[PDB]
């Protein structure tokens, strides 16, 4: 009581981890897993309390009998009034982004192109613009639409692979974890702006957090927004300030899940850690800042406001919602109810 274990994936996070185990005098600490499935595991046996999860991997963690405990939130012009920790959710967009150079790619011609995605079972990346393309073709495969893909979490010598580049070292190839240079909203944007792949599947915020300045990342420096386009489903191509009306789907936010015997006792640890650590923190700026990794994602995603309490006490399933919900049911056909481990 009082100390939360913290799943980190990957070596980096680990190291983000160490330090906020660090300023927190221990109350928080790491058990660190190559994956996130090794994380719901850890979790699952009660080795570690919690961590912050997509939607994709809400849904099996929920199945694991995991629950939700707070959402990230972000930057909003709506409910501005609400203090953020009270604020709904609003979800964020999926989008299929293209290089504008690329001329007369539509979703309409993405059969046998290059795509880049952000892990196999994310939402942006995987669930939603897979469960269009299962749909759309009627058929199940879906590791022979795309002619090669890097999709973390495939077999590393499929062609779901192929498009992977690894570590420093090329170890690594197709890890989803952010060892895997084109892994997470970061990686598979990466792989379209360097022009390994022709189409990636990120969220909105991604394009503008690496675009006209503001990421400084040396991939990123030079990137230009209207360098790239939206692929809408009506087969159109948009600027990506368009987004309101161009996107695939609106997905919910990543949150913090544990076991449900957890869940109160996690949650005011991670209340508390934010007031510190969060950003109006006393300690982030100066210390340390929880919702901050240089562009990287780790732990949290960087555009994080806050942590909100979610009010409903919702199971995964309202969390996820029935629209979302089905959506991969019907997906994971192609791979009916049960934890997979
Ligand atoms: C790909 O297609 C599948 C198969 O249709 C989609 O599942 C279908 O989509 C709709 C929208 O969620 C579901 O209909 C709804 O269901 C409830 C009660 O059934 C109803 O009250 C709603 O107003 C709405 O009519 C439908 O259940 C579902 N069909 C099946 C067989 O499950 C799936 O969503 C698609 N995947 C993606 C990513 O679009
Ligand atoms: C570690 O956790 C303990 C217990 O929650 C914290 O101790 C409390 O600190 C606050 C602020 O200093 C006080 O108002 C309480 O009276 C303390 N006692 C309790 C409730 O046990 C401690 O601050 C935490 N350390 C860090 C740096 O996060
Ligand atoms: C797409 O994402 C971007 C980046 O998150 C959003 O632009 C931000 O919007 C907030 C408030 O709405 C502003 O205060 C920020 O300055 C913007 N960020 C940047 C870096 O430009 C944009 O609103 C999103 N669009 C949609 C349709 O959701
Ligand atoms: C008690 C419940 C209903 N309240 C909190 C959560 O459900 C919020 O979850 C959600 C978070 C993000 C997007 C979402 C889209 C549809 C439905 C729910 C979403
Ligand atoms: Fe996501
Ligand atoms: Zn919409
Ligand atoms: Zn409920």
Not at 244 to 273: G, I, T
């Amino acid at each position: 009581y009082t100390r939360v274990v913290w799943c980190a994936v990957g070596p980096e996070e680990q190291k983000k981890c160490q330090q906020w185990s660090q300023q927190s005098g221990q109350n928080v600490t790491c058990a660190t897993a190559s994956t996130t499935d090794d994380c719901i595991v850890l979790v699952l046996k009660g080795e570690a309390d919690a961590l912050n999860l997509d939607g994709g991997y809400i849904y099996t963690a929920g199945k694991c009998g995991l629950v939700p405990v707070l959402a990230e939130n972000r930057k909003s012009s709506k409910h501005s009034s609400l203090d953020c920790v009270l604020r709904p959710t609003e979800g964020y967009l999926a989008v299929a982004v293209v290089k504008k150079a690329n001329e007369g790619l539509t979703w309409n011609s993405l059969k046998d192109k290059k795509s880049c995605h952000t892990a196999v079972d994310r939402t942006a990346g995987w669930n939603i613009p897979m469960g269009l393309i299962v749909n759309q073709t009627g058929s199940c495969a879906f590791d022979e639409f795309f002619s090669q893909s890097c999709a973390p979490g495939a077999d590393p010598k499929s062609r779901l692979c192929a498009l992977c580049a690894g570590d420093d070292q090329g170890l690594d190839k197709c890890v989803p974890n952010s060892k895997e240079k084109y892994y997470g909203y970061t990686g598979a944007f990466r792989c379209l702006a360097e022009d390994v792949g022709d189409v990636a599947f990120v969220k909105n915020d991604t394009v503008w957090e690496n675009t006209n300045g503001e990421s400084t990342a040396d991939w990123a420096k030079n990137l230009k927004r209207e360098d790239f386009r939206l692929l809408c489903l009506d087969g159109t191509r948009k600027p990506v300030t368009e987004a309101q009306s161009c996107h695939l789907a609106v997905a919910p936010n990543h949150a913090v899940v544990s076991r449900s015997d957890r869940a109160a006792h996690v949650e005011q640890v991670l209340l508390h850690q934010q007031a510190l650590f969060g950003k109006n923190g006393k300690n982030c700026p100066d210390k340390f800042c929880l919702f901050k990794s240089e562009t990287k994602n780790l732990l949290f995603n960087d555009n994080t406001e806050c942590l909100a309490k979610l009010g409903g006490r919702p199971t995964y399933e309202e969390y996820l919602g029935t629209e979302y919900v089905t959506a991969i049911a019907n997906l994971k056909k192609c791979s009916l109810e049960a934890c997979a481990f």
